[model samples]
Target: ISARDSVGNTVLHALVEVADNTVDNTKFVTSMYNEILILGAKLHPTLKLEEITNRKGLTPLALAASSGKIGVLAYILQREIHEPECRHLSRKFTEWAYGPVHSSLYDLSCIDTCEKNSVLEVIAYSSSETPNRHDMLLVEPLNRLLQDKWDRFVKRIFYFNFFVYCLYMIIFTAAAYYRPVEGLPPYKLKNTVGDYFRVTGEILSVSGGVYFFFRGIQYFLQRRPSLKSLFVDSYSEILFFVQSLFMLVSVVLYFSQRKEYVASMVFSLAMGWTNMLYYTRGFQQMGIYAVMIEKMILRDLCRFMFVYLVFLFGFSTAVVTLIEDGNSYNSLYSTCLELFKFTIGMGDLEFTENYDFKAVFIILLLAYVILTYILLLNMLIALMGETVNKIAQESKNIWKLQRAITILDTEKSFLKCMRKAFRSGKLLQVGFTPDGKDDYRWCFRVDEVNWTTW
Candidate 1:
């Protein structure tokens, strides 16, 4: 076979003929992505994926990343096969805190090209379009880069942003809550804590209005955000824009003690607090916990509710039909409430208070109690353990994505002067060609610590 191709794809084909024909044949289960990376490693353990880049600087890893080839990308990114337990936070924490990273699993030298573009940035930006925003996070170096950006640049801006929000939410909630209470002629003001709190709140609301307006304009002028990208890449910024709308509405109707005004205040305040979790993405431990809860609520708990409602509705209707006229279970609505009362352990049992199917009702009520309460509630507990285990498998990736979102938002938020210090070391010198000198670009430096007895 002639070794004439750029990435030497022919060499891959040639090896198939030889490795298969030879006694170490092992026949390599199948083809495409899995077998190639597998065969490459099994046959040539020392040949880093870094060496497989084409002349144009597209490694198979980067190409897979660009095209949303999850399998190939994951194949290249796996840390477990070479270095076990590196995925667990308990075992992986030291490497995460500081790394004597095993290059048997990853090669830091292979991350960038001659043009200074990064593999991390390529996967991130492209995957956003490919609609697998969470998938790329599975790769080790991708997460490692996000961790690098967080510890170095993004963490400082995070606290500053959190404080800004806490103050913003404080004024809005206090302002909304402290206003004149029931039936006091809606606009009464006196020299009390309520009045003084409101005075400061009004001033802050005006400032928030101005700040909100400025940033809304800034998003347009600077970001030129599209309707499509608005909900995709920069969704959170516009989420802030929407929250500001409520604040401005609250600001507009600040004089009136109406319910809508209070609602606007509450919406803006609580939504701002919801963003505090969004801010937690910079803190790795709590950030991962936020992801765990988010995934559980959206996935595990949501499915459980669907399954639960079927039982609840079935029992409610059956009991409604089984009951005699004018009893609590006489109508569908009353029957539902009665069943709910029973569910909460506050309903009458087998009784003779104007009832037919006395025997059937007792059996049915017993069945409902045993099925819905005993069985389903217990099942939900088991699901939580299942949810935790599955989410733990994906925990790092979710946290990585969250932290990546934090980095980009914080980076954009930095003023021009602050950007310089934070953005340093984004360019590193690494020469890919053996014949050439060291090349400089936007490469992140990862020091592989040598752990002997350190």
Candidate 2:
């Protein structure tokens, strides 16, 4: 039953196909699917059935997962746990620090068995298919993988990085804002300090830029995706790249000449603000507020702007006819500015006296105030409030999800640090041989190293 056909698919793969085809009729077909999978496993329990691939390099497990066959996938995962190939599924926190990266197995298309996802990745990718079931599957693994492994040393490294970033943001903002006046440049030590801050900020900018550049490259290599596909994943990464680029340009221009202070300030302010907000992702409780704000801006503010612009344009055209001084209300551009001021409660009827305004004009002005101020502005406030309250209900779960992502990112860093330590000979290796022959099975194991307590 485990024999492969011409296409490399075995009986297990064929059975999975049958199960997929019978998805609609759950009564006998579902029961039959379960029985067949169990029977195949019992008959050829040691044949590596779950690991066998078709011509596409996909195993029956991968097929069932991507196809959303909940029952089959569950059974396969249970059976896979007992396989010799899966004997390394030790539920040890120490192993998690050194285990193969689940991310490395992730393919852009996830087509091949070698590129098949781990349990966590499967749950993450297949979330839309069976959210509740996948979510339930997440609890035990995450608690074991994350909660046990997130030691104090991990927290210290994370906190150190966080504080360094925060301090750098402050220094960069201060330097950009309080830049020395051109032609009246400071003397002696003040000039030296100013030069030092600029140099520091520039170094920080280059460091951040390089970090993101390599980060992008890592994603491309691991996922094997196109350049355009990179932007489709995380908005934060794209924004971070932009911020780094802007700072690089700003610092270069600042040193070349003091001719671009305005541009430098704008870029610096933007980078500083975005960087501050990005830090919220590190704290679970505070991070949900950021997510809520992002949702409001992307969804509610967009819908409000559509209506707000329509009303603004209507009022601008009406007022353009009334106020014809030819200075501020002469062109459509000026008319828009004047009405925009009114929208924000900055415009006064006193400005109309210069044009000999009439009663009808005053009535129009009052009507504009009622619609723009009383209606549109208040409506926006109500919309924002409703969005806040709606998100507040599920904020805890959302934060947990964000924290899980943070934990995974931290794990990657820990692995990098561990590899560096190994190369430096500060740590001892188990299966890894420095001779480099047949080195595929090498991994770092935490044994008796005193400093490896973290």
Quote the positional error of residue 303 for candidate 1 in Å.
Answer: 2.1
Per-residue alpha-carbon lDDT of model 1 for 177-265, expressed as tens digits?
76666662346567887687797886786687569767877867765656676655564566677788887886567555455677776
| Model 2 alpha-carbon miss at residue 128, Å | 8.0
Task: Give the least accurate 10-residue stretch of model 1, judged by summed lDDT.
Answer: 85-94
Best by TM-score: 2
- What tens digits encode model 2's per-residue C-alpha lDDT throughout 261-367? 45755775676577677667557667888878777878888997898788778876777767658335556677677767887669866555434568867787788
lDDT for 349 in candidate 2 is 68
For model 2 the TM-score comes to: 0.69
- Scored against the true structure, residue 403 in model 2 reaches a CA lDDT of 55
